[PDB]
Amino acid sequence: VHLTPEEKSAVTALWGKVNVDEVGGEALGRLLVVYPWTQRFFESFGDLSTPDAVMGNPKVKAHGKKVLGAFSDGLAHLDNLKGTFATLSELHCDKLHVDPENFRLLGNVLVCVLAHHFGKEFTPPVQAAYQKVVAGVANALAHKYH
């Protein structure tokens, strides 16, 4: 996960504008709606029967906040994502048994949320930088499988 300085610049400048109370919940909700097998890991969250029910679920927004915080943590430690995500990798791999393909999916859904929220500002080069980031996070989160 080597971002060039231009890549680092594109990523960090957009990230400073992210509403960190909302975007992680938007991404988790879309994950549950677009890829409904992921709802298997979130039965304790209650009503997920409709997209509206998902996106307005307070457990979804509250848990998405923590997810986004982990992405924020990774963005700070691009040179040691393995270390940053070791604890979450044990949780997701050894305890939760989430298939790591779903880490890739959540990363892609996050990218769609950023595109939705930033529009033209989410240029193809900015996307390409974010794709390096969400790939690095998914790989580090999957390290306890590797």
Binding site: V34, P51, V54, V111, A115, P124, Q127, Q131
Partner: protein, 139 residues
């Protein structure tokens, strides 16, 4: 299969893309080439730099294929038969790459249609592009 609601959602999102379909297809291809550089090898005879007339012309081709699929959503295997042969037999396109372009098409729609790209319409579009990809990889 695609549900009636999915068909409605896809139809309406396509309706709002309008005459930008060709442009958005070109942008999705550029997003794919920059984000997933392995896909570039399928277009050696293309200049893939920004503003390429060849990327532009091919984006329109791709958009027109997707519009034909939308217009014949209940008969996609038949509608896309000739393109399925092309992609599996001649071009030998790795199936993984349809996932990458589908994602980039979603990203392009999200960047351009803020009102239309709700979680439900996002889900329907993903299913539609997955269905197109299944057909194009069927041979």
């Amino acid at each position: 299969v695609l549900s009636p609601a999915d068909k409605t959602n896809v139809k309406a999102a396509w309706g709002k893309v309008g005459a930008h379909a060709g442009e958005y297809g070109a942008e999705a291809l550029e997003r794919m080439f920059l984000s997933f550089p392995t896909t570039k090898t399928y277009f050696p005879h293309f200049d893939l730099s920004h503003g390429s007339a060849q990327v532009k012309g091919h984006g329109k081709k791709v958009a027109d294929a997707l519009t034909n699929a939308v217009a014949h959503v209940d008969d996609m295997p038949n509608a896309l038969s000739a393109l399925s042969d092309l992609h599996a037999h001649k071009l030998r396109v790795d199936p993984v790459n349809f996932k990458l372009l589908s994602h980039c098409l979603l990203v392009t729609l999200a960047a351009h249609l803020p009102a239309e790209f709700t979680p439900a319409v996002h889900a329907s579009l993903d299913k539609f592009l997955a269905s197109v990809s299944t057909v194009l990889t069927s041979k």
